[PDB]
Amino acid sequence: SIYQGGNKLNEDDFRSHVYSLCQLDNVGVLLGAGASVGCGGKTMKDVWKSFKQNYPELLGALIDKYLLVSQIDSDNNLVNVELLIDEATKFLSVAKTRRCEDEEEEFRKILSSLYKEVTKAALLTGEQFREKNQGKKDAFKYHKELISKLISNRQPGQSAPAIFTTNYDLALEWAAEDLGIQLFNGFSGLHTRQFYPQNFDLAFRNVNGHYHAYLYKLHGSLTWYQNDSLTVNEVSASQAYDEYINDIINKDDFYRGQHLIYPGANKYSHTIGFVYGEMFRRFGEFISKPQTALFINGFGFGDYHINRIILGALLNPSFHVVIYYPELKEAITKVSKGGGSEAEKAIVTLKNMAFNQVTVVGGGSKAYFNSFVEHLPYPVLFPRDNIVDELVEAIANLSK
Amino acid sequence: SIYQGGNKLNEDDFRSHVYSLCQLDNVGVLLGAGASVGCGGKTMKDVWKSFKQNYPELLGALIDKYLLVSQIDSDNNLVNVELLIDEATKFLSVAKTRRCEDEEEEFRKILSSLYKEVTKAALLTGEQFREKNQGKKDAFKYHKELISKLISNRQPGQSAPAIFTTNYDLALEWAAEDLGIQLFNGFSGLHTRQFYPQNFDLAFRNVNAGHYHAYLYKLHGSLTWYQNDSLTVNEVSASQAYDEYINDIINKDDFYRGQHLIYPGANKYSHTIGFVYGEMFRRFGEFISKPQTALFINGFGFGDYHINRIILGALLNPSFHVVIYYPELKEAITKVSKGGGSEAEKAIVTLKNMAFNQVTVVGGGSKAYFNSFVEHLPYPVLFPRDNIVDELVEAIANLSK
Amino acid sequence: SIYQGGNKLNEDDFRSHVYSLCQLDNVGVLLGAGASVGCGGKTMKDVWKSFKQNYPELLGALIDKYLLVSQIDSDNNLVNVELLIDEATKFLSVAKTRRCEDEEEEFRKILSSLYKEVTKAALLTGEQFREKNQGKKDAFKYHKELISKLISNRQPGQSAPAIFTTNYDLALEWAAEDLGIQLFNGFSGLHTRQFYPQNFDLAFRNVNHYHAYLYKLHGSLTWYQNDSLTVNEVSASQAYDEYINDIINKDDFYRGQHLIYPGANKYSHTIGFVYGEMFRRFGEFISKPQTALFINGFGFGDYHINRIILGALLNPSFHVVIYYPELKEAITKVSKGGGSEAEKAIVTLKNMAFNQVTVVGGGSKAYFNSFVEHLPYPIVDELVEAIANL
Amino acid sequence: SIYQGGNKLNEDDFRSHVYSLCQLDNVGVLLGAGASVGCGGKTMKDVWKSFKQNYPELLGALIDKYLLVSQIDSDNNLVNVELLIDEATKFLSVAKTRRCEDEEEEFRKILSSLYKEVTKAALLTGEQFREKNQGKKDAFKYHKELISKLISNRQPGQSAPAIFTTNYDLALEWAAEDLGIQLFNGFSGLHTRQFYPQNFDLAFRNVNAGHYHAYLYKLHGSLTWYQNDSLTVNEVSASQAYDEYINDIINKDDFYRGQHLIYPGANKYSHTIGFVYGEMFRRFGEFISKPQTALFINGFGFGDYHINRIILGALLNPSFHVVIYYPELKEAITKVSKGGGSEAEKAIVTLKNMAFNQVTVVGGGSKAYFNSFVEHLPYPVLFPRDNIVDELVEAIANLS
Amino acid sequence: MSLFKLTEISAIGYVVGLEGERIRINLHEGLQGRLAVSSVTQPGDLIGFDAGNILVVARVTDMAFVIPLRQIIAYAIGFV
């Protein structure tokens, strides 16, 4: 259920390990699409169901003529959504060049529908997305405990925690604003908010505070947009909803470059994307520092770039990771029988290492977000040696 | 019934925590109108009940014509005094501006009758207010114990305690003058006492090289202070004050013209000539903005906006600890769960649900009273037990246990 | 016309003195509505005049039935347009509480008109108020110089400059945003901004780019109070689309105890809390050792500010420089029996007998733009257009 | 013809300027397809002439059917050769996916000619490509001098020189293996070479107290990189590559494998091959965003859009300097002054007129060739300019 | 703390040495302004000395150097 360095480990030693791992110089977390299921979010398996239920003729067009999707793969709900966007884009580009009119419209429709379905799954609150004080509801309860626990375990003179994520939704911002804490994400201004790469080198100081962190969104956001002038701006939820989100959701208008998000396999196709590169440079610079710890939760292990990066950080003899994977044994067995997908081979390769710096957790529902948060400890205020207390119980043990 | 950071903790852990807190650099206490209930004072609920049964026609005029008090709140006793006073003041201001006559005189009588009830409840001893040695009675035993406990716990090179309050009575002044301690409250002189903001930075010293002292901040004024026409504030003694201007307020009627300065109002920023009020709150805000600070709150009802905002905003400092006492916590939780609750109850329920280990809340009915709060505070341990043979004592005892 | 305690001065000595003062630790600047006229602003006299000749049929009730305006002041264009709004709000609240349907409808029209004249004179760009990069234009050119030379002159280890203002427009915000520096105005957040009074004790640093502090003494266009008893701030576009548009382009409508400009709904305990903090911060700053102050555009129409200003001069380290244009025309009245209280106060400030106050007068010689020139001194478009050309 | 903001400056001032930019914190060089023409290479418009003189039958079908190239460009020899192979691979891939059997031969037959043409021009030695010690010949006399001059004028505590290129041949490797220098290029191993992107942050040091290494970024691939059956990129030696696949490409007339080769920027649609291309560009963009950088450009024709866009944006930093060699200013200035020429001419002439001191353009025909570039660079005082070792080696060989 | 305040004085230097009818003086630096209004920065002038009971009058003679330091030499002529 819990493995370290290939061997098996027990619960008490795991708790003692987790406690002493939070005293190091660097602490960070990387969250995925599963960490927001308890708030109103969805996964990539539900998007395919929604697509195949709402649009029943485009599915037949995909299956019969172009042969992009097979029948059995669609029946079992085992078709990758990211790998289909790239193929559709390739077909559209080829058709456009040779001046074909009829075959150019269908792929436009497919891309518009597939982009619309992805957007709906990130609001988390439906039409209530435009209101205010959305962090006061009971759903955003464990995000607050996560931030409080992370931020209170910081001795003076150290560095603030860092958070990476691949969601488009505003869960962390809603949680932190209701709590009163500030996060730095590279933007500045109110009437004209712009992206500045050098805004990641700042910090607070007291004129005569101390509660803040950083936030990196690797695959873009739902309130970001580019006005084609090689600048990127950020606005509020209500302004974005009144500007473009509502038209996409309801008016079924054709999709354009309203907001920059990155669903797809190859992220290097876009050439003028200078935020993705900055985010990944800052991510790659974080894991090369000595005395670092990282906790991974909700990540499905299906991205080439990210797990390509993770493997290269195990050549440093001061790096530690803890990985939460619910369905570990099913991945364990399928590999011995011939192998599963590329997603399930990576975790099995990671587990079977021989370094006492990789820990993998499994166990179904005991490796969830709520289970994750409660494992983190609270600071000890007013520490004391307490030697005489153990002397007293070492009296009582013989008194037994 | 004791929470810390949302979770629960028992009696012994609480006592060790309370012992640890009293060893820090700065310590202070904030008291409310419920702390002086065991001495002879009374709360606002009693003020409203005694008001409604003394001037029936004025209450009837308030309810019927001016529509300021609902017919239901009078019977269930939920009327708020401060908001009523402010509304009456606004009515008087507009009546003065539009030059109406009958309504202005009608409101003057109400505004005068309302202050008489407030003043009568702060005397604490009735007729013996104008006498001496009032702190020798047994009603002031726990005030003396609180003062003795606070001062004894300091170390050389540390600063003296501070006391903030919103009462008008003299219980805490009477108590100290029986111990021989000195309280600094910002006044100087005998034949002419005047207020100086500068002398909040004074301390004793011995010429051959009286080591006990403290400070007292009165947020809502006092029953002894009175302002003269020259825009200065003077202070007298209890006997002289009773003999010159609060024998005409009580026994005789319609005699209030700014005779002494108090703040029974909800909006205290409107008065643009009260600088004592702005002096006290500045010091209060300065105290809780320092490293290694502890604050104990007792008797407060959490129905004041400025204080709630100040307390909430100080919780982002990593060296601030509060302990809040609140008797009726269970009812507040129950009522908030149903989507209702008073504006005071949401504030106290919100504090209890925080995830920081720097907030502690105590409930329990009669276990969170004033006499119980004093008993929690520790006695100093002089001569920390020499040698380490207490370990041998514990062995000898516990092995046979 | 340069005076110093009844004396006279030449240009060069004053230009050296202002540099000498700027080498201090605590440096501050106080402004007024006089600095907004060079960008499209107005004054109290102008808006009062505009009000009189647009709504004359209801001017009588402000003098006959309710006694809000002095007839001499109305015919003299000297009324103060801040207390009128406050008293109108008090009257409307009392009427609404009394359930007087007949008299409740009277004051709503008056308030609707007054807010229309107030808002019309503060957009500074008309219908372009909601657009972006509005601080890039040539009109907002002089303001950037002030901030630049205030930041540059400060030595390492010096405190940041502080700025106080009576205006409630978005003028300095655009200048600072398009310069590329950050100002702390006391709010924080994006999807819900809230007022925290303790943010005034913050500062940046480099982990191995500057800032300044901005106080608004009378509110701003982008603040309001919603149903929940909390104060919010939005952008220019959001405010325009929410409430500002209807106020200018509708006949008759009123909301109530909503807006926080200018000094309006002081009768509530949630809105006065913000008003008090700015004033107490100014009072605490002005009473510190080794401070300076460069007053400009202020007509001395406030009773309370002068009381604080005079009292702080008891310390020898408090230095004041005033810029009062129409000085001699006040002296002439002062010699006569007539005058006004602001004129009496300013001439009393003239007739002092010490070298700490420095009054400056004249015509165009004492304007905001001239003061910008007195303070010391501290191709990208080609590359942008070349990149866009590709 | 030397300009600096529009003002002509003499030779000695230019030399004193070059001497001062070679002692900054960061120094770089960018080289194009004209820099290897003194070794046996060809330019881009010499390849089109050979193709259209050798295969006149496919040229009609490649213009009149699939609209892959214009008539004006193919008449004026202005074809972008490596931008056509990518589109051809896309066409072939889509045809293979949808199973159109008649269209596969028409693309498998032209991709076999494009490679047969571009491959042969990059060998530089014909049949001697598989032999050893190719760096001892006289064609590579100036590459050695460039590498030697770049390394010898660094002071302790300073970075290493960086070299970027768009050539995909083996000239620089052969030159550097003869001096004994070691060049990092992202690969490690001998019995299996593999691509490790994180080793661009590694450096050497001496255990007794050496500083002899540099970095090489190949933007368009190499002849010796290929993708085997598994999804990893390998590197081999020149002899091994020649015996594995190059011989059949040059000789056999119906040889096409599939998505196998990694030159020149071809199989970009695949998500494990575009990863290699993306890293080089990300690091190129990162290099020129530093406080004290100086970059020399030689052999480049300015016929690219992304590189021009990156270079223009890096000039809004007051401490970045550029030096440009272009042997055709005279024939471009007039064509722009009268009516306007091409995009390359427009770019270079817009750059020439800028009123900065940070740009310098050099022209004059043979006066701005690769060979003339080397002697403008300094030469250290203590660098040994003699020949003593070789005489001793001759005497040793003569012995017995 | 209360109203009473005592010190009000404004000088330009202090005596640092006496050598048989010859006086040395050190001039102030940290003073942002020596304004009170008269200032003496040149030889030939007259200066005064508060000795508690009487006033001693002198006459400036020299200036020189050696935040650096400035020095002055004077001679005495009478008292008031």
Ligand SMILES: Nc1ncnc2c1ncn2[C@@H]1O[C@H](COP(=O)(O)OP(=O)(O)OC[C@H]2O[C@H](O)[C@H](O)[C@@H]2O)[C@@H](O)[C@H]1O
């Ligand atoms: N309540 C839960 N708590 C924690 N984990 C959970 C929970 N429920 C499910 N999981 C696990 O959470 C995981 C969810 O798997 P996927 O939906 O593929 O998450 P992704 O973020 O990788 O997918 C996003 C893709 O798009 C992006 O652009 C990236 O490129 C991705 O390719 C599974 O392991 C679940 O068992």
Ligand SMILES: Nc1ncnc2c1ncn2[C@@H]1O[C@H](COP(=O)(O)OP(=O)(O)OC[C@H]2O[C@H](O)[C@H](O)[C@@H]2O)[C@@H](O)[C@H]1O
């Ligand atoms: N013996 C006791 N010991 C401690 N607390 C007690 C006791 N008896 C009652 N309480 C609690 O005492 C608490 C407060 O009683 P209230 O009179 O409502 O407090 P306030 O909100 O008026 O606060 C006082 C001032 O606040 C305003 O600003 C005005 O200026 C007031 O004068 C209640 O919770 C009781 O349960």
Ligand SMILES: Nc1ncnc2c1ncn2[C@@H]1O[C@H](COP(=O)(O)OP(=O)(O)OC[C@H]2O[C@H](O)[C@H](O)[C@@H]2O)[C@@H](O)[C@H]1O
């Ligand atoms: N171009 C100019 N340059 C310089 N000074 C000017 C200029 N134009 C006018 N002035 C001067 O600047 C003065 C500004 O006139 P007013 O608008 O009454 O002054 P305020 O806005 O500061 O007073 C309003 C505040 O005071 C009260 O408390 C109110 O409630 C507000 O809080 C003119 O009289 C000229 O002397």
Ligand SMILES: Nc1ncnc2c1ncn2[C@@H]1O[C@H](COP(=O)(O)OP(=O)(O)OC[C@H]2O[C@H](O)[C@H](O)[C@@H]2O)[C@@H](O)[C@H]1O
């Ligand atoms: N001996 C010489 N020395 C120096 N320069 C020379 C010499 N001979 C010719 N030239 C010049 O060398 C230049 C030859 O330019 P070309 O080979 O067409 O351009 P590229 O190498 O960028 O082509 C590859 C790019 O194509 C896409 O754009 C991608 O971005 C690729 O990077 C001309 O200016 C000649 O005058």
